């Protein structure tokens, strides 16, 4: 269950390893993985489309995927998660960046804090649906991405 | 000849239109474009290779191109030049971003500034060889990338 508030027990050594195993295949193809994930989240959540100005005009899966702006945006969203997994052994480091990234969303991108957990699930489902460990990493990211609000 | 110091005359309207016409084709396939340019720079400029710590172990086009790191790095570079062509009508914003990038290069990445113009040339020969207009933009960017040095 991915949350964006409250507390989440630390990540066991066992969980971390699994996460790295599942994420590797996905990331090795981040250009595609990021897109498909972002686009699905987009299309499946109409209420959160007004927060992607550079996407305006496009609404169908076909369009989105051919858009360079949709691609560049997907690649950054995905790498932000990669940086997270590659830093599960440093909570102080992970939190600082995500607190920074939280600031941009709240202060600059002005995105609704309620869609982070939604996109996160669209990531957990693709990376390893059902993994309590991965949903735990997400809960950590979502909690951080709301720290600025 | 691209330069990285002093100054250069503003880009005329004609030059801006020429630049945006030659750029579109290249940026359209940026995931591929960037990677081609980067590898061409890297492989052809030995001394500058030590400045790419994450490519530790790769020195051939084949190994490079098939790397997530090399591409992510290339995608970010090519996209910074894109922001630049996108801001030809607002040199202020262009400079703000480029100055920030300059600081990152001189502080975190510890990169020798002599190479900005060389990588810029690789981009010039790829987008529009010989075009004085584009060369000027590259000069503008390099002068800006060295401002924090
Ligand atoms: C899984 C959680 C998310 C992560 C890890 C994430 C990560 C990122 C990253 C790395 C950037 C790059 C910012 C930069 O270049 O400085 C970004 C940009 C952006 N994100 Fe998120 N994001 C997430 C969820 C969301 C959600 C739910 C929305 C929509 C409500 C959203 C909307 C945006 C917007 C508007 C931009 C700016 C695009 C631009 O103007 O270039 N993000 N995000
Ligand atoms: C046209 C010239 C150049 C542009 C526009 C450019 C742009 C960029 C951008 C946008 C980043 C992303 C930083 C971030 O993620 O916040 C970056 C990182 C980096 N650049 Fe450059 N760059 C240029 C030339 C060079 C040159 C000549 C070298 C090598 C001598 C170089 C070495 C690096 C390194 C080592 C990093 C850090 C990579 C990492 O650890 O992720 N760059 N550059």
């Amino acid at each position: 269950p991915i949350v964006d508030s409250g507390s989440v027990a630390p990540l066991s050594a066992a969980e971390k390893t699994k996460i790295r195993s599942a994420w590797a295949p996905v990331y090795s193809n981040y250009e595609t993985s990021g897109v498909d994930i972002l686009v699905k989240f987009f299309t499946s959540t109409p209420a959160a489309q007004e927060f992607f100005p550079k996407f305006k005009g496009m609404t169908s899966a076909d369009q989105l995927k051919k858009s360079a702006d949709v691609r560049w945006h997907a690649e950054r969203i995905i790498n932000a998660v990669n940086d997270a997994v590659a830093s599960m052994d440093d909570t102080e480091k992970m939190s600082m960046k995500l607190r920074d990234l939280s600031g941009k969303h709240a202060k600059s991108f002005q995105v609704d804090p309620q869609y982070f957990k939604v996109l996160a699930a669209v990531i957990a489902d693709t990376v390893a649906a059902g993994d309590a460990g991965f949903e735990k990493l997400m809960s950590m990211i979502c909690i951080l991405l709301r720290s600025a609000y």
Side-chain angles (χ1 to χ4, degrees), chain A residues 100-111 116 145 149:
Chain A
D100 196 64
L101 202 41
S102 181
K104 296 183 193 163
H105 286 82
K107 295 173 172 59
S108 304
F109 309 145
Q110 292 173 287
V111 306
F116 289 130
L145 290 181
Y149 300 75

Side-chain angles (χ1 to χ4, degrees), chain A residues 73-84:
Chain A
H73 193 174
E75 286 139 42
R76 290 140 65 209
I77 297 183
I78 194 65
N79 273 282
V81 192
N82 181 59
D83 299 313

